[PDB]
C-alpha cells in the first residue's frame, strides 16, 4: 500500500504551478546540484555561534507531541523546559535533554546498537585484550606508505562496495551486470538472508555493510611490521623519539 501513498504525494506536488517547471526540466544527475543550495557562505565560526546558542534560555528545536506525551512543563524550581512560540515544533532548553536522560521512558534496544556498530566494538574488544611493556627511547622514522588499517576478512577495493550495496538492498535500479558478480553473488545470497527483515533503515544498512568489507587504506607514516591489526594503534606504538612494543600475541 506504499504505492498509493507515494502516488498521493506525487499527485499532491504536481498541484503546485511553479514546481512543475522544476522537475521534468532538470536531469537525473542534477539531484546532486539539487541537494546543495546552501546559500550561507561558510558558517565560519561554528563554536562561537554554538556558545552564543547555548547561552540563551531556549536554543533547541524539539518535537511537541512526544514531549507532551511524557515530559513535564517545569521542573521543581523554576527550570523552564517549554515554549508556546512557533509546523508544530517547539523550542526548549537542554535541561529537557538531561531530564529526558534521567526521568524518561526506556525501550530495550541494546541488540540493535550492538549490531550496527560491530566495527567499533570490534576495535574495543581488540583494544582491551592487549598487553604493553617498556619504552625504548631511540631514534625512529620511515617514509609514507599506503596502508589498509582495519582487520577485515573480505578486502574489497571500494568499487564492489557501492556495486555490492546496489545488488543487496535494492536491485530494481541497481547497475549493469558486470563479470564481478558471480562469486560475490554467492555472497549476495549470503547477505539477503541477513538484511531481509530488520528494523534497520536502508541508509543505516548501507552504512553498516561498508565498514565490515572495506579495509581503510590511507597514506600514513609507518614503521616496523605493517600488519593491519596494529595500524589503528599507529599513534600509540611510537612517535619520533620514543617507541613502545611488547605484544606477545
Amino acid at each position: 500500500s506504499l504505492l498509493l501513498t507515494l502516488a498521493k504525494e506525487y499527485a499532491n506536488l504536481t498541484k503546485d504551478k511553479k514546481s512543475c517547471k522544476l522537475l521534468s526540466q532538470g536531469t537525473v544527475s542534477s539531484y546532486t546540484t539539487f541537494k546543495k543550495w546552501t546559500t550561507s557562505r561558510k558558517e565560519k565560526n561554528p563554536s562561537l555561534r554554538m556558545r552564543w546558542a547555548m547561552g540563551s534560555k531556549f536554543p533547541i528545536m524539539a518535537n511537541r507531541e512526544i514531549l507532551e506525551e511524557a515530559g513535564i512543563p517545569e521542573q521543581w524550581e523554576g527550570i523552564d523546559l517549554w515554549s508556546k512560540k512557533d509546523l508544530g515544533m517547539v523550542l526548549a532548553s537542554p535541561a529537557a535533554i538531561t531530564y529526558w536522560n534521567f526521568c524518561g521512558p526506556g525501550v530495550d534496544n541494546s541488540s540493535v546498537i550492538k549490531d550496527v556498530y560491530k566495527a567499533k566494538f570490534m576495535k574495543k574488544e581488540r583494544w582491551r585484550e592487549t598487553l604493553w611493556g617498556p619504552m625504548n627511547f631511540e631514534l625512529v622514522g620511515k617514509q609514507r606508505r599506503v596502508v589498509e588499517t582495519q582487520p577485515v576478512e573480505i578486502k574489497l577495493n571500494q568499487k564492489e562496495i557501492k556495486e555490492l550495496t546496489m545488488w543487496v538492498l535494492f536491485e530494481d535500479e541497481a547497475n549493469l551486470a558486470s563479470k564481478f558478480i558471480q562469486e560475490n553473488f554467492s555472497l549476495v545470497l549470503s547477505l539477503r538472508e541477513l538484511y531481509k527483515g530488520k528494523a534497520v533503515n536502508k541508509d543505516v544498512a548501507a552504512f553498516m555493510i561498508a565498514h565490515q568489507f572495506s579495509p581503510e587504506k590511507r597514506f600514513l607514516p609507518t614503521f616496523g611490521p605493517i600488519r593491519p591489526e596494529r595500524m589503528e594503534l599507529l599513534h600509540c606504538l611510537g612517535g619520533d623519539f620514543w617507541k613502545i612494543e611488547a605484544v606477545t600475541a
Partner: protein, 705 residues
C-alpha cells in the same frame, strides 16, 4: 636584572627552539573596508613589470591590448623584476627536459590525463570552494552558481541533456555563439542581455581581501573566478597534476622528506677530489604577477603535440580566457568633509567622474590604469592571480632546475609553488659566482624572479622549505594552527569525538609528542564542558542543568558510566583516541540509563558517532525579513523535490544518480515498474491499481499542461 627569552639557542639547535618564534596563539590579521587599492596595486604593478609599450588594438573588446611576450625594452635595472618571457628559450628547456626521462613522456602523461577526462561527470565541479555568480554578481557556493548558470542555459535556448564535462564545455562555447542570453533578476523578473556583454561577463574575476593570513605586514588581494573558467582549469590541473606526479624533483602532492634525503645523499655521492656543495634557500617574490598565460599557451601547445584532436583544442582555452580577464575593482572609496561628519560613498562605477576627490597615491595608481578600465572592471592580460593554475608553474620550476649548459660544475634542487632549495656543486667561489649568476640568469630569462633579500646558503644541509627547517641531522615539524582543535560546534555528541579525531590526525601527521596530546585533550575537554554547561557530579556547580543531575544522581548505580555530556568524568586517554566516548562507556551503564539515553523515540533527534544527543539549533530572524525570502522559498522547493525523489528511489544517497532523461519521468516509469512487479506477486486489486494508475495519468496530464 634583565631577561631575554632567546638565549636558549646558545646551546640548542633550531629544531627545538623554533616553535617558540611563531605568533600562532594571537589574533590573525583582518582587513577592513574596501579592497580597491590592493587590486589597483596588483594591476598597475603587473603593467609596470611588463617592460614594454607595444600595444595591439582589439576588435572584440573596446579596450587596448598590451603584449607580454618577446617584446622587451631592456632597462639597466635588470635586478628589478621583469614579466617578459622568451618562448624559444623555455621551449628549448622543454626539449631539454623531455630528453632527460623517456622519449614519449608528454604523450604518456597526456594520454593518462585524457583517460581521466573522459570518465568525469560534471558534478565534480561542485566539489570546490566559492565562485562568482554573474547573475546576481555575487560570491556564491559552487552548486548555486552552477545551478544559476544551467538555469540561464535551460531558460535561454533549449534544455540541457549533457551530463558530461565535454558537452558542458561545448554548451559554454555555444553560449558564446548565442546572440542573446536571458536570465532572471530581482519579485523574480526575467531579463535579457546582448552578445558582447555576455563575453565581458563570462571573463570576469572577482577580487577580495585575503583575511587571516599569518605572515605579512601588508595586505594582499585574492581573486576568485567565475563558473565558465572552472572546468577548463580542472582539465589543466588534471594534466599538470599527472605531470607533477610523474616528475621526481617536485613536492606538491605528497613525500617531501625522502626526496631531499635521496638527492642530498645521491648528489653527495657525485663529488670529485676538489668539488663541494652549497645550498641556497630562496623565496621567489612577485610570483603572481610574473607568470603570463601566453607562455602557458605555448607550452600547453607543446605538451599535447601528439595526443588527440580533442585534447589539443581542449587544453588551449583556459590560457585564452586568462589572456583577456577582467578584474572587479572592489567597491570604491569614501569621501568626507573638513569636519569629518558627512561621508559619501563612491563605488567603482563613478570613479572616473569623481576623479578629483582622491589622494596622491590613489591618483598615481589611477592614472597608470586609466587606458585599461571598463565601466566597473579592469582589463588584465598577463596576470596569474591566486586560485588558479598551481601545479603548472612548478613544472617551470623543474624546467629551470633541469638546465644543461654543455669544469663539471652544476646544480639541482627542489621546487614548490614559490619556494625552492637549490644545491650547487663547484670547485671555487668565483666559479660559485659564475654558476649562481647563471641560475639567476636562466630564471630571469624564463620569467622567474628570485628575491635577493630572502635568500641565503651554507655548505651542508641547513636550509628551509615550506617552513620545515632541516638542520644537519634532524627535522623540525610544521607549526600547526591551534583553532583546528575546536571548529565542530554542532552537537553535544559530535564535538569531543571530533576533537579526539583531530588530535589523532595531528599526532600521526605532525610530531605532537604525547603529553602535549594529553594536555590538548584535557583543554578541549574543558572547553566542551564550559561551552555546553555540563560539569561533573562531584563538582560544586549549581546551574539549571546541574540541579537535575545533582538531584537524580541517587538513581544511577554505577557512577563512572555516565556520559561527559551528562556529568561524567573523563575515560578516554591517549591510547583510546580512536574509540568514541559512548562505545567505550556502554559496558558499564545502568540499563535504565542506557535504555533511556538510546531511545530512538525522543523529542529531539526525531522530526561519525552515535546519534543520541543530536539536536538542531533554531534558525535566525533576519533571514525572512529582507528581500531574499523567496530564496529560502526556492531551497524549500528543492528540499521538497529531493525528499520526493528520495522517497521514490530507496537507495539514492549511496550511488550517484546518473542519467539524462528527466526526474519525474523516472518517477512515473519507476512507479509503473514496481506497480507491475509488486502487482503480479503481491497486490492484485482493481480499485488500488486503477486508482494509482488514475493518479499517475492525472498527474501526468497536470504536469504536461
Amino acid at each position: 636584572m634583565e631577561i631575554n627569552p632567546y638565549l636558549l639557542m646558545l646551546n640548542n639547535d633550531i629544531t627545538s627552539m623554533i616553535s617558540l618564534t611563531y605568533p600562532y596563539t594571537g589574533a590573525p590579521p583582518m582587513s577592513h573596508g574596501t579592497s580597491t587599492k590592493y587590486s589597483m596595486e596588483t594591476v598597475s604593478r603587473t603593467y609596470s613589470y611588463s617592460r614594454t609599450k607595444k600595444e595591439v588594438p582589439s576588435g572584440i573588446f573596446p579596450i587596448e591590448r598590451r603584449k607580454f611576450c618577446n617584446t622587451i625594452e631592456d632597462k639597466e635595472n635588470l635586478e628589478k623584476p621583469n614579466g617578459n618571457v622568451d618562448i624559444n628559450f623555455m621551449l628549448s628547456l622543454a626539449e631539454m627536459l623531455e630528453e632527460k626521462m623517456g622519449k614519449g613522456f608528454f604523450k604518456f602523461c597526456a594520454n593518462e590525463a585524457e583517460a581521466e577526462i573522459l570518465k568525469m561527470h560534471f558534478s565534480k565541479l561542485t566539489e570546490g570552494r566559492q565562485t562568482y555568480d554573474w547573475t546576481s554578481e555575487r560570491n556564491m557556493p559552487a552548486a548555486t552558481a552552477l545551478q544559476l548558470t544551467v538555469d540561464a542555459i535551460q531558460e535561454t535556448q533549449g534544455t540541457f541533456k549533457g551530463t558530461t564535462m565535454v558537452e558542458y564545455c561545448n554548451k559554454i562555447l555555444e553560449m558564446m555563439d548565442w546572440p542573446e542570453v536571458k536570465f532572471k533578476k530581482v519579485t523574480l523578473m526575467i531579463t535579457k542581455i546582448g552578445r558582447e556583454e555576455f563575453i565581458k561577463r563570462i571573463c570576469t574575476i572577482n577580487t577580495m581581501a585575503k583575511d587571516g593570513e599569518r605572515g605579512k605586514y601588508k595586505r594582499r588581494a585574492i581573486a576568485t573566478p567565475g563558473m565558465g573558467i572552472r572546468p577548463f582549469s580542472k582539465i589543466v590541473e588534471t594534466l599538470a597534476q599527472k605531470i607533477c606526479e610523474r616528475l621526481a624533483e617536485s613536492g606538491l602532492p605528497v613525500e617531501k622528506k625522502a626526496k631531499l634525503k635521496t638527492t642530498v645523499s645521491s648528489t653527495n655521492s657525485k663529488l670529485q677530489e676538489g668539488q663541494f656543495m652549497v645550498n641556497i634557500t630562496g623565496d621567489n617574490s612577485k610570483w603572481n604577477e610574473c607568470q603570463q598565460p601566453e607562455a602557458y599557451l605555448a607550452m600547453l601547445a607543446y605538451i599535447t603535440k601528439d595526443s588527440s584532436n580533442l585534447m589539443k583544442d581542449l587544453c588551449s582555452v583556459a590560457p585564452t580566457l586568462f589572456c583577456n580577464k577582467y578584474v572587479k575593482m572592489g567597491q570604491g572609496f569614501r569621501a568626507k568633509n573638513k569636519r569629518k561628519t558627512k561621508e559619501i560613498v563612491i563605488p567603482a562605477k563613478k570613479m572616473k567622474e569623481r576623479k578629483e576627490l582622491m589622494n596622491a597615491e590613489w591618483r598615481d595608481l589611477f592614472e597608470t590604469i586609466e587606458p585599461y578600465m571598463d565601466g566597473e572592471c579592469c582589463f588584465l592580460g598577463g596576470g596569474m592571480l591566486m586560485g588558479m593554475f598551481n601545479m603548472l608553474s612548478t613544472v617551470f620550476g623543474v624546467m629551470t632546475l633541469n638546465y644543461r649548459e654543455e669544469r663539471n660544475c652544476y646544480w639541482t634542487g627542489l621546487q614548490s609553488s614559490d619556494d625552492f632549495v637549490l644545491f650547487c656543486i663547484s670547485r671555487t667561489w668565483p666559479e660559485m659566482e659564475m654558476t649562481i649568476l647563471k641560475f639567476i640568469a636562466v630564471c630571469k630569462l624564463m620569467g622567474i624572479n628570485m628575491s635577493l633579500e630572502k635568500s641565503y646558503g651554507c655548505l651542508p644541509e641547513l636550509f628551509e622549505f615550506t617552513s620545515m627547517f632541516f638542520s644537519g641531522d634532524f627535522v623540525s615539524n610544521i607549526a600547526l594552527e591551534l583553532p583546528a582543535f575546536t571548529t565542530a560546534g554542532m552537537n553535544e555528541g559530535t564535538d569531543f569525538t571530533a576533537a579526539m579525531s583531530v588530535i589523532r590526525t595531528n599526532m600521526i601527521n605532525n610530531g605532537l609528542s604525547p603529553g602535549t596530546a594529553l594536555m590538548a585533550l584535557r583543554i578541549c575537554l574543558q572547553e566542551f564542558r564550559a561551552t555546553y554547561r555540563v560539569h561533573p557530579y562531584d563538582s560544586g556547580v549549581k546551574n539549571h542543568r546541574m540541579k537535575i543531575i545533582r538531584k537524580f544522581i541517587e538513581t544511577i548505580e554505577n557512577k563512572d558510566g555516565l556520559l561527559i555530556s551528562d556529568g561524567g568524568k573523563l575515560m578516554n586517554n591517549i591510547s583510546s583516541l580512536h574509540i568514541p566516548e559512548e562505545i567505550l562507556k556502554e559496558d558499564l551503564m545502568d540499563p535504565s540509563y542506557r535504555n533511556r539515553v538510546f531511545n530512538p523515540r525522543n523529542p529531539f533527534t526525531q522530526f561519525a558517532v552515535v546519534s543520541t544527543h543530536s539536536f538542531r539549533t533554531r534558525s535566525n530572524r533576519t533571514l525572512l525579513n529582507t528581500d531574499m525570502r523567496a530564496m529560502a522559498l526556492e531551497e524549500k522547493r528543492y528540499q521538497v523535490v529531493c525528499n520526493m525523489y528520495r522517497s521514490v528511489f530507496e537507495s539514492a544517497d549511496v550511488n550517484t544518480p546518473i542519467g539524462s532523461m528527466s526526474m519525474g519521468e523516472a518517477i512515473e516509469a519507476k512507479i509503473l515498474d514496481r506497480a507491475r512487479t509488486q502487482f503480479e506477486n503481491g497486490i492484485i486489486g482493481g480499485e488500488e491499481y486503477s486508482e494509482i494508475k488514475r493518479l499517475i495519468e492525472d498527474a501526468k496530464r497536470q504536469r504536461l499542461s
